[PDB]
């Protein structure tokens, strides 16, 4: 006898397990066990993944309900699960979304300058270089300090919360509350700080004193800062790190993009499609009995939407493991989700990766791994897949 299939399958972010394709073919919705011991339905085809994400009766908010089957323990207060809904109810969605586009004057130049400085320091120090800890993550951190309007020198401390805050744990995590409460106090201070006049926190600080927002809570204003910094930094740093691996493993593509950088946006869209940065399926709780494929999902059950299930589905993306810059459906992947909860940072995440890759290919056209790929150490029980270090030479 064997136990019920456990998720996640593998923390490795450099290859998809052969098993995903066999599951998609045989049982594109099927029962699994999460690290908490809960049962869940794992959805792994493009068609069924999009069905679940576009039907709000598969609820994000309700995943936080006491007593629900859980993917993992919350590392945030349960109200944060409904963060975007709370932002919309407060009348803040348009302003928040406008502040996190990559369009502010100077933003892209700042990204380019920062990437080039980071790369020059690595070149000066000499190979090998760690492209996660000394390039992708500092680039993400610097970007989000700029986007939020907060001092660059405050970035590293906020960043160091994230190796715990985005854990995927069976049990509550005492350090997550300590860091959460500290980071909330920081953002509350930022809202009171008269020098903070630009970016997301500068805008929230003005709206906070506007009569139309006088009953929006100071807790929610601070929560927006903490959550958008953390989600954006972990998501862009992790995605860029594992996209760099996929690029380095493809010398012909690396060379093509170095030679024709106008193709980098199309290359980044494929790197998004094939990205394994999300370590777990996206969780939703059924609020009704709903037919998904051959399974009648019952009210109260947990559903997990496997992004790489959709994004490597050959029925939607032929030759799914190959990076093709001429696909007819290039942005139709699920790397940013789909539906009500589609990532509000998508444009920023694209631009962070495009500029980081453009800068890397110009400065380090010969970039290559400095260790055999199997020597990368994949972080476990985390909400992202990332190598602890990414050692390269050039």
Give the interface with ligand HEM as residue ranges (CB under 6 A). 60, 84, 100, 228, 231-232, 235-236, 239, 277, 282, 335-337, 341, 343-345, 348-349
80 binds ligand EW2 (CB under 6 A): yes
Question: In Å, how far are 7, 245, 310 from 280, measured between CA atoms?
Answer: 8, 20, 13
Closest approach, Cβ 348 to ligand HEM, in A, equals 4
Instruction: Please tell me the distance from the alpha carbon of residue 160 to that of residue 174, in angstroms, as a whole number.
Output: 15
Instruction: Please tell me the distance from the alpha carbon of residue 140 to that of residue 155, in angstroms, as a whole number.
Output: 10
Of the two residues 97 and 127, which places its CB atom closer to ligand HEM in the complex?
A: 97
Closest CA to 276 of 379, 391, 351, 154: 379
Question: What is the H or E stretch that residue 58 is in?
Answer: strand 58-59
Encoded tokens for 11: 């923390």
236 binds ligand EW2 (CB under 6 A): no
Encoded tokens for 25: 């073919």
In the DSSP assignment, the letter for residue 170 is: S
334 binds ligand EW2 (CB under 6 A): no
In the DSSP assignment, the letter for residue 97 is: H
Closest approach, Cβ 53 to ligand EW2, in A, equals 15
Closest approach, Cβ 2 to ligand HEM, in A, equals 30
In the DSSP assignment, the letter for residue 25 is: H
- Residue nearest ligand EW2 by beta-carbon distance: 230
| Partner that binds at residue 239, options ligand HEM, ligand EW2, none, CB closer than 5 to 8 Å by kind | ligand HEM
86 binds ligand EW2 (CB under 6 A): no
Closest CA to 239 of 336, 169, 109: 336
Instruction: Please tell me the distance from the alpha carbon of residue 170 to that of residue 38, in angstroms, as a whole number.
Output: 10
230 binds ligand EW2 (CB under 6 A): yes
- Sole residue written with tokens 């050692």: 391
Closest approach, Cβ 124 to ligand HEM, in A, equals 29
Of the two residues 17 and 337, which places its CB atom closer to ligand EW2 in the complex?
A: 337
Binding mask of the shown chain, residues 163 to 202, with x at each position contacting ligand EW2 by CB under 6 A: --xx-------------x--x-------------------
Of the two residues 180 and 221, which places its CB atom closer to ligand EW2 in the complex?
A: 180
Of the two residues 114 and 168, which places its CB atom closer to ligand EW2 in the complex?
A: 168
- Find the part of the chain contacting ligand EW2 (CB under 6 A) among 25-33, 80-88, 190-198, 292-300: 80-88
76 binds ligand EW2 (CB under 6 A): yes
- Asked if residues 88 and 61 have their Cβ atoms less than 8 Å apart, the reply is no
- Asked if residues 289 and 298 have their Cβ atoms less than 8 Å apart, the reply is yes
- Which 3 state secondary structure label does DSSP give 12? coil
Closest approach, Cβ 125 to ligand HEM, in A, equals 27
Closest approach, Cβ 215 to ligand EW2, in A, equals 22
In the DSSP assignment, the letter for residue 213 is: G
Q: Count Cβ atoms within 10 A of the Cβ of residue 351 and give its class: 0-12 exposed, 13-18 middle, 19 or more buried.
A: buried
Query: Phi, psi at residue 241, to the nearest 5°?
Result: -60, -50
231 binds ligand EW2 (CB under 6 A): yes
The string of DSSP letters for 115-151 reads HHHHHHHHHHH-S-EETIIIIIHHHHHHHHHHHHT--
382 binds ligand EW2 (CB under 6 A): no
- Asked if residues 93 and 84 have their Cβ atoms less than 8 Å apart, the reply is yes
Query: Phi, psi at residue 392, to the nearest 5°?
Result: -130, 160
> Residues comprising the binding site?
75, 83-84, 235, 284, 299, 341, 343, 383
| Partner that binds at residue 336, options ligand HEM, ligand EW2, none, CB closer than 5 to 8 Å by kind | ligand HEM
38 binds ligand EW2 (CB under 6 A): no
Count of CA atoms in the C-beta half-sphere (13 A) of 27: 9
75 binds ligand EW2 (CB under 6 A): yes
| Partner that binds at residue 344, options ligand EW2, ligand HEM, none, CB closer than 5 to 8 Å by kind | ligand HEM
Question: Which residues in this chain contact ligand EW2 in the complex, by CB under 6 A?
Answer: 72, 74-76, 80-81, 83, 161, 165-166, 180, 183, 226-227, 230-231
């Amino acid at each position: 006898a064997t136990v019920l299939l456990e998720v996640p399958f593998s923390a490795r972010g450099d290859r998809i397990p052969d098993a995903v394709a066999e599951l998609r073919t045989r049982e594109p919705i099927r029962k699994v066990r999460t690290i908490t011991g809960a049962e869940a339905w794992l959805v792994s085809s493009y068609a069924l993944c999009t069905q679940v994400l576009e039907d709000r009766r598969f609820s994000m908010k309700e995943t936080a309900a006491a007593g629900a089957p859980r993917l993992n323990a919350l590392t945030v207060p349960p109200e944060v699960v409904n963060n975007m809904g709370n932002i919309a109810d407060a009348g803040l969605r348009k302003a928040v979304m406008k502040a996190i586009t990559p369009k502010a004057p100077g933003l892209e130049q700042f990204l380019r300058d920062t990437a080039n400085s980071l790369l020059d320091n690595l070149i000066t120090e000499g190979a090998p270089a760690d492209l996660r800890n000394d390039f992708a993550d500092p680039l993400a951190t610097a970007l989000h300090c700029k986007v939020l309007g907060i001092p660059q020198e405050d970035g590293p401390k906020l960043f160091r919360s994230l190796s715990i805050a985005f854990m995927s744990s069976a049990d509550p995590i005492p350090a997550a509350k300590i860091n959460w409460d500290r980071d909330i106090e920081y953002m509350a201070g930022i809202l009171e700080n008269p020098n903070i006049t630009t970016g997301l926190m500068g805008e929230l600080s003005r709206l906070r004193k506007d009569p139309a927002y006088s009953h929006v809570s100071d807790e929610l204003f601070a929560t927006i800062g903490v959550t958008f910094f953390g989600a954006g930094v972990i998501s862009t740093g992790s995605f860029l790190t594992t996209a760099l691996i996929s690029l380095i493993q493809r010398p012909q593509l690396r060379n093509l993009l170095h030679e024709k950088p106008e193709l980098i946006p199309a290359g980044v869209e494929e790197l998004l499609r094939i990205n394994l940065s999300f370590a777990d399926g996206l969780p939703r709780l059924a609020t009704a009995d709903i037919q998904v494929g051959d399974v009648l999902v019952r009210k109260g059950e947990l559903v997990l939407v496997l992004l790489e299930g959709a994004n490597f589905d050959p029925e939607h993306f032929p030759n799914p493991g190959s990076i093709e810059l001429d696909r007819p459906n290039p942005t139709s992947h699920l790397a940013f989700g789909r539906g009500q909860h589609f990532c509000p940072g998508s444009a920023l995440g694209r631009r962070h990766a495009q500029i980081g890759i453009e800068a890397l290919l110009k400065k380090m056209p010969g970039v290559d791994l400095a260790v055999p790929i199997d020597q990368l150490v994949w972080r476990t029980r985390f909400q992202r897949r990332i190598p602890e270090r990414l050692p390269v030479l050039w």
